[PDB]
């Protein structure tokens, strides 16, 4: 956010500078559009970076017609550039023209509004009053910037200022060939993924989020770089994530430095990056370079996450959902070329049936082909963000994958999916323990290879604390895991890694599932053609207290006897056609809508494996058992592999368990973690033992546990009080021979690292350790300085005791170039020194920079780094001649 008068003068100062660059034969290193080309940032070969505005801020007042604002431009005459005002020469006293390039100043004509409310223009001592200013929308003096060929870059104006071409810098570094062909980082049951968010809402230092993830988890992790689509509804402009490209770039470099996988620019229609309609645009269109760039330069980049694609379409500043699907059609090809994933996540309401994962492939036949053909690259995820329809949306998201249109299936859980005011069981606020249930249920019984989140990131995963002292009198920003992150999430993944929780393959799920619905309906409302049959789940796994479809407010199943029921558009391949029972929805209203008849046919397909009010589903020798109701709840489960007779289970509310049957052993992973520290009680009884059993228990993470044992009349009874997760082992043998046989250890394969990133590293000043600085801007959007990288910058300031430090890295020993992007608006700063590894190496030339709020500059140093960690400091020695600002540093090999 900024005033119209700032915007105008910025463009003028830019026009002066472009002309200066032209006659000094300077080159454009980089340019990039923002807010769909409302503004651009521009870097030249001398390191000068500045904004130009294609849209000007409204003029405070309220009026909203287009009205007059002065237009300072430039024409050429007798070989020379002179200032224009509204397409006539700019003159003051006499009729003397005024050169752009005058041998004394770098003062441009300044436009203003005086105190009688008239526009004015001043140039040194001279000054000129023009027309009355008037509240209204204004038009910019500048149109846009495009590229000509691969040589030229053109700046075009809206007045009669000529076009201005500058050469497009070519860098003499040999470009690094990208990764193509096969998938960069395969995902499968053997190689699952956790998407952990570096979140614009946490105002992250990516480096410190990465480090909060332990080593055993890291290799299975895919860091998800979240750009918030929070914006000003009137203008369109993004705040939280002001410069999305620049955040993504900065954090994607840190990821690439740390050799970890990474991928998120949209929520609903809103997106920091412009949608395409043709595959050609990925190379030919200077409005959409970001797509190719991330794949080309970062070998750890897996692609793009379009989350929550159910809202915000057809906005003034979004796109239609059709246009989005179309963008996916092209983007998916791009993704396939580079071995990437495109991820989509859906949560549902009544208004959004026509944009769900059925409609996705049923409404757009071209996307359907491109999806089918590159399913390996396409990942479809259930989101738990909306207030209803969870079983419908679970079926459909699962159906996408099994039917062959997506390669992997995932869950993105959210607190926000707890029912509002009343909640569930008598618990107003969402309790974290609840979250473990859907996830384990859908991972173990429906083949999810991707866990995403959980949300909200900043309530469930990480928070920033106050700054902390880190030696030598320096202080740093700091981040911490929430306890439920460690005690639910981290530990649940350890239980996948350690092969307790075996993820079934697609073909394994179809054999279990048995049945599919095909959505072959073309008549009726949006719900009739894209959503599942309304009473699909009734008298199956849907609770008594809950209701059908959009009155389905609870995601806990009443029973696990019947498997999650998938709903697809079509079956694309051999395997999808191996479904035992294919039911067309058109027949559904006739036959299956009678709840009793459905339950009758389903009962023949899916035998009773237990009784009681707990949730119990079995796959191979693994049970998921949980309690999603109030009060102690029970079940009687006859064993299928263990040689004892049966187990009777009695569990507290929101206790979840994973129970592995062995001929002479049982394991329980149990959890029910409350951060406030309460205990819960659980009771396990084994029947049919022909021997005194024994038991073993280990607490996990920050959990507690005590277990009591009771042998009596051939019943063995374990009483497990605990807070948080634990593994319990029961050695119990019986005398049965009618029992199945346990297959050998499922595979878990530790996912390979990405190739080593050979490009430049970046370290944002707002993440530096610091002492005695004037101001540290971690949330820049609300402050006066524009055109910065990531979310912020700092004002180092003039203190003689001012200093900063970060830890930087180097693939090996040698000379590197350190580019400090900075601002020195009032005076040159010759008074700050640089230390590498606690040895002073020079005094960067921080030349006076232009006063304008968008201008930054870059100061260079050559230095020796050694292989691995290096320490970087900037230290004042005296009082600065003026404020020094710092946005970042960028390190590259010479």
Ligand X SMILES: OC[C@@H]1O[C@H](O[C@@H]2[C@@H](O)[C@H](O[C@@H]3CO[C@@H](O[C@@H]4CO[C@@H](O[C@@H]5CO[C@@H](O)[C@H](O)[C@H]5O[C@@H]5OC[C@@H](O)[C@H](O)[C@H]5O)[C@H](O)[C@H]4O[C@H]4O[C@@H](CO)[C@H](O)[C@H]4O)[C@H](O[C@H]4O[C@@H](CO)[C@H](O)[C@H]4O)[C@H]3O[C@@H]3OC[C@@H](O)[C@H](O)[C@H]3O)OC[C@H]2O)[C@H](O)[C@H]1O
Build a one-symbol-per-residue string for 771-790: x at contacts with Ca ion by CB under 5 A, - elsewhere: ------------------xx
> What's the CA gap between 391 and 552, in Å, rounded?
8
Q: Which is nearer to ligand X, 313 or 579 (CB)?
A: 313
Nearest-Å Rg of the Cα atoms of the chain is: 32
Among 36, 146, 235, 349, binds ligand X (CB under 6 A): 349
When asked if residue 387 is in the footprint of ligand X (CB under 6 A), the reply is yes
**Coil, helix or strand at residue 213:** coil
Among 164, 307, 488, 637, binds ligand X (CB under 6 A): 307
* Stretch of 18-26, 664-672, 792-800, 801-809 contacting Ca ion, by CB under 5 A: 792-800
Quick one: which of 336, 312, 339 has its CA closest to 324? 312
When asked if residue 322 is in the footprint of ligand X (CB under 6 A), the reply is no
The percent helix, strand, coil of the chain (3-state, each to 5) is 20, 35, 45
> What's the CA gap between 29 and 49, in Å, rounded?
10
- Check the chain for breaks (C–N over 2.5 Å) and list the residue before each, or none: 263
Q: Tell me how far CA of residue 487 lies from CA of 354, 504, 506, 655, in angstroms.
A: 39, 25, 29, 13
Under 8 Å between Cβ of 371 and 348:
no
What, of Ca ion, ligand X, none, does residue 790 touch, CB below 5 to 8 Å by kind? Ca ion
Report the 10 Å Cβ neighbour count for 47.
17
When asked if residue 355 is in the footprint of ligand X (CB under 6 A), the reply is yes
Q: Which is nearer to Ca ion, 407 or 780 (CB)?
A: 780
Among 51, 281, 352, 857, binds ligand X (CB under 6 A): 352
What, of ligand X, Ca ion, none, does residue 224 touch, CB below 5 to 8 Å by kind? none
Among 351, 594, 749, 842, binds ligand X (CB under 6 A): 351
When asked if residue 385 is in the footprint of ligand X (CB under 6 A), the reply is yes
Among 228, 254, 300, 858, binds ligand X (CB under 6 A): 228
Build a one-symbol-per-residue string for 246-285: x at contacts with ligand X by CB under 6 A, - elsewhere: ---------------------x------------------
Among 764, 781, 850, 873, binds Ca ion (CB under 5 A): 764
Phi-psi region of 577 (alpha: psi -120 to 50; beta: other; left: phi over 0): alpha
Instruction: Locate 101 and state its tokens.
Output: 């390039």
Shortest distance in whole angstroms from residue 764 CB to Ca ion: 4
What, of Ca ion, ligand X, none, does residue 267 touch, CB below 5 to 8 Å by kind? ligand X
Q: Tell me how far CA of residue 414 lies from CA of 249, 347, 436, in angstroms.
A: 27, 10, 11
Contact set for ligand X, span 556-575 (CB under 6 A): none
Q: Which is nearer to Ca ion, 629 or 820 (CB)?
A: 820
* Stretch of 17-25, 529-537, 654-662, 759-767 contacting Ca ion, by CB under 5 A: 759-767
Under 8 Å between Cβ of 262 and 193:
no
What, of Ca ion, ligand X, none, does residue 887 touch, CB below 5 to 8 Å by kind? Ca ion
Under 8 Å between Cβ of 303 and 341:
yes
Q: How many residues bind Ca ion (CB under 5 A)?
A: 6
End-to-end CA distance of the chain: 38
CA within 13 Å, CB half, 325? 22
What, of ligand X, Ca ion, none, does residue 221 touch, CB below 5 to 8 Å by kind? none
When asked if residue 455 is in the footprint of Ca ion (CB under 5 A), the reply is no
Under 8 Å between Cβ of 224 and 305:
yes
Instruction: Locate 786 and state its tokens.
Output: 């524009």
Build a one-symbol-per-residue string for 171-210: x at contacts with ligand X by CB under 6 A, - elsewhere: ----------------------------x-----------
Classify residue 101 by its DSSP letter: S
- Listed in sequence order, the residues at least 6 apart from 322 whose beta carbon sits closer than 8 Å to its beta carbon are 363, 364
* Stretch of 272-280, 416-424, 762-770, 838-846 contacting Ca ion, by CB under 5 A: 762-770
> What's the CA gap between 661 and 616, in Å, rounded?
14
Q: Which is nearer to ligand X, 452 or 727 (CB)?
A: 452
Among 96, 102, 314, 813, binds ligand X (CB under 6 A): 314
The footprint of Ca ion (CB under 5 A) covers: 764, 789-790, 793, 887-888
The footprint of ligand X (CB under 6 A) covers: 199, 226, 228-230, 267, 307-308, 310-314, 321, 349, 351-352, 355, 385-387, 416, 455-456
């Amino acid at each position: 956010p900024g005033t119209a008068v700032e915007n105008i003068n910025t463009n003028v100062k830019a026009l002066r500078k472009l002309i200066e660059a032209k006659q000094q034969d300077l080159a454009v290193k980089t340019y990039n559009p923002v807010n769909n080309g409302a503004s651009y940032t521009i870097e030249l070969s001398d390191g000068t970076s500045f904004s130009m505005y294609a849209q000007i801020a409204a003029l405070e007042g309220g009026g909203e017609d287009v009205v007059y604002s002065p237009k300072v431009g430039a024409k050429v005459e007798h070989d020379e550039y002179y200032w224009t005002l509204d397409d006539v020469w700019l003159t003051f006293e006499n009729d003397e023209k005024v050169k752009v390039l005058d041998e004394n100043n770098t003062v441009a004509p300044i436009v203003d509004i005086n105190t009688d409310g008239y526009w004015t223009v001043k140039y040194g001592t001279k000054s000129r009053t023009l027309d009355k200013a008037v509240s209204g929308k204004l038009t910019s003096q500048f149109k846009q910037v495009s590229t000509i060929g691969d040589e030229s870059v053109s700046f075009t104006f809206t007045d009669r200022t000529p076009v201005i071409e500058l050469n497009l810098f070519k860098g003499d570094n040999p470009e690094i060939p990208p990764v193509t062909g096969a998938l960069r980082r395969p995902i499968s049951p053997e190689q699952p993924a956790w998407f952990v968010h570096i979140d614009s809402w946490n105002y992250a230092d990516p480096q410190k989020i990465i480090d909060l993830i332990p080593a055993d988890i890291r290799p299975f992790t895919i860091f998800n770089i979240s750009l918030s689509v929070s914006h000003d509804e009137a203008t369109g402009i993004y705040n939280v994530s002001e410069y999305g490209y620049e955040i993504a770039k900065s954090w994607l470099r840190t990821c690439a430095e740390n050799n970890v996988w990474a991928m998120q620019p949209s929520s609903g229609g809103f997106s920091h990056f412009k949608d395409v309609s043709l595959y050609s645009q990925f190379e030919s269109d200077d409005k959409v370079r970001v797509y190719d760039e991330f794949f080309r330069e970062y070998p750890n980049f897996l692609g793009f996450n379009y989350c929550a694609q159910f809202w915000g379409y057809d906005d003034q500043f979004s796109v239609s959902w059709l246009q989005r699907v179309a963008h996916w059609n092209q983007l998916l090809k791009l993704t396939h070329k580079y071995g990437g994933y495109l991820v989509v996540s859906f949560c549902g309401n009544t208004w959004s049936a026509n944009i769900n994962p059925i409609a996705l492939v049923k409404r757009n036949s071209d996307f359907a082909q491109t999806a089918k053909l590159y399913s390996e690259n396409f990942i479809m995820c259930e989101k738990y963000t909306t207030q209803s329809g969870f079983f419908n949306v679970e079926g459909i998201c699962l159906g996408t994958w099994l039917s062959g249109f997506a390669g992997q299936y995932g869950i993105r859980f959210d607190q926000c999916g707890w029912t509002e005011e009343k909640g569930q069981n008598g618990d107003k606020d969402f309790p974290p323990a609840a979250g473990a249930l859907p996830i384990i249920e859908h991972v173990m019984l429906t083949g999810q290879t991707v866990i995403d989140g959980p949300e909200l990131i900043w309530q469930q995963c990480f928070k920033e604390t106050n700054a902390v002292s880190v030696g030598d009198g320096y202080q740093s920003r700091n981040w911490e895991c929430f306890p439920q992150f460690v005690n639910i999430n981290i530990d649940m993944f350890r239980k996948i890694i350690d092969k307790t929780i075996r993820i079934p393959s697609r073909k394994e799920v179809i054999d279990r599932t048995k049945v599919v619905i095909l959505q072959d309906v073309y008549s009726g409302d949006d719900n009739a053609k894209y959503s599942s049959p309304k009473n699909l789940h009734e008298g199956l796994y849907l609770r008594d207290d809950d209701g059908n479809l959009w009155d389905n407010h609870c995601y806990f199943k009443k029973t696990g006897r019947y498997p999650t029921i998938p709903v697809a558009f079509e079956l694309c391949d051999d395997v999808a056609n191996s479904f035992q029972y294919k039911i067309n929805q058109s027949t559904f209203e006739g036959s299956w809508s009678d709840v009793n008849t459905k339950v009758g046919k389903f009962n023949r397909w899916f035998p009773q494996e237990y009784t009681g009010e707990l949730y119990a589903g079995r796959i191979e020798n693994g049970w998921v058992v949980y309690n999603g109701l109030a009060g102690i709840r029970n079940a009687a489960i006859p064993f299928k592999y263990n040689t004892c007779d049966k187990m009777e289970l009695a569990y507290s509310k929101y206790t979840v368990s994973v129970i592995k049957e062995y001929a002479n052993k049982l394991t329980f992973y149990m959890n029910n973690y409350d951060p406030s520290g309460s205990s819960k009680t659980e009771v396990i009884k084994i029947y049919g033992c022909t021997s005194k059993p024994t038991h073993s228990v280990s607490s996990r993470a920050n959990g507690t546990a005590q277990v009591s044992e009771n042998w009596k009349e051939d019943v063995y009874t374990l009483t497990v009080t605990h807070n948080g997760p634990l593994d319990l082992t029961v050695n119990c043998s019986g005398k049965a021979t009618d029992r199945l046989t346990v297959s050998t250890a499922a595979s878990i394969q530790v996912p390979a690292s990405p190739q080593i990133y050979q490009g430049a590293y970046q370290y944002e000043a707002e993440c530096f350790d610091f002492k005695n600085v004037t101001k540290r801007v971690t949330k820049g959007d609300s402050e006066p300085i524009r055109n910065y990288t990531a979310q912020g910058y700092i004002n180092f300031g003039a203190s003689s005791a001012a200093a900063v430090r970060d830890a930087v890295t180097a693939l090996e020993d040698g000379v590197y170039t350190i580019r400090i992007r900075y601002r020195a608006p009032s005076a040159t700063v010759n008074t700050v020194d640089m230390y590498i590894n606690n040895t002073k190496v020079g005094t960067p030339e921080f030349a006076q920079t232009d006063n304008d709020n968008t201008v930054w500059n870059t100061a260079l140093m050559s230095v020796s780094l050694r292989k691995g960690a290096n320490t970087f400091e900037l230290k004042a020695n005296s009082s600065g001649a003026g404020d020094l600002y710092l946005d970042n540093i960028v390190i590259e090999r010479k």
